[PDB]
């Protein structure tokens, strides 16, 4: 399948070269997979989600996304227009308040929730969790991310936006999960993207168009935006039978575009997520 005039980031993950605007993908489009978006929530009523999104948990007085960030990330995973995996099921877990903040104990609770909750959902092709959040190093937070991964969920995490080594941020620094940096439409590392030997992969993170609250859309930047590209790609590949939750990060790195990025510090991988689709 081909979607013309796609957001640049969708075009980029289905291309060997920058500078094109068509997203090429298998029509299966992540059907039968599930993706948990652990964030500020999801505006499930947004037309772009077509009834495929729902809120399953909150730790606040409401499950509503009063911020926008979680809706945007969910949009990049699985919205009809802006998403990688256009037929995936999206589940929202609201660990961040409407200011975008959360205590680590809440975030930890949210990750352990997903490890259990996946047993209550129909996801025959596999389960992914997308975590577009972080903060300073915490062994407790890393341990929670490692447990979620161990439980059979592909965990994709944002590297952070400090232009620093991601080894000092959590859960970015947990080795067993898939830590995602950000690139721009000219194949440069995004200027804010963290880096380091703990990164596994880069995805599109600068000027990413997706869903927003109030039934709207907007373009924003961050490793928060790169992470859902990789989460959506994992869901897509698992539907196709190419990989599993345990192996998906490795498979994505093995099949990535290699050596195409600029401004990669020595010691950081030069790997850009790629869906390997040949129509
Ligand atoms: Ca890793």
UniProtKB/Swiss-Prot annotation:
Cofactor descriptive note: Binds 2 calcium ions per subunit.
Record-annotated Peptidase S8 domain positions: 7-279
Key word Zinc present: no
Top-level EC class: hydrolase
Gene Ontology MF terms in the entry: metal ion binding; serine-type endopeptidase activity
Reaction(s) catalysed by this chain's protein: Hydrolysis of keratin, and of other proteins with subtilisin-like specificity. Hydrolyzes peptide amides
Cofactor: Ca(2+)
Residues of the full protein shown: 106 to 384 of 384
Name recorded for this polypeptide: Proteinase K
One GO term describing the cellular component: extracellular region
Gene transcribed to yield this protein: PROK
Isomerase as UniProt keyword: no
Record function comment: Hydrolyzes keratin at aromatic and hydrophobic residues.
Disulfide pairings: 34-123, 178-249
Highest taxon in the source lineage: Eukaryota
Keywords of the record: Calcium, Disulfide bond, Hydrolase, Metal-binding, Protease, Serine protease, Signal, Zymogen
Binding site for Ca(2+) 2: 16, 260
EC number assigned by the record: 3.4.21.64
Entry annotation: catalytic residues: 39 (charge relay system), 69 (charge relay system), 224 (charge relay system)
Binding sites annotated in the UniProt record for Ca(2+) 1: 175, 177, 200
Organism: Parengyodontium album
Family that this chain belongs to: Belongs to the peptidase S8 family.
GO biological process, one term: proteolysis
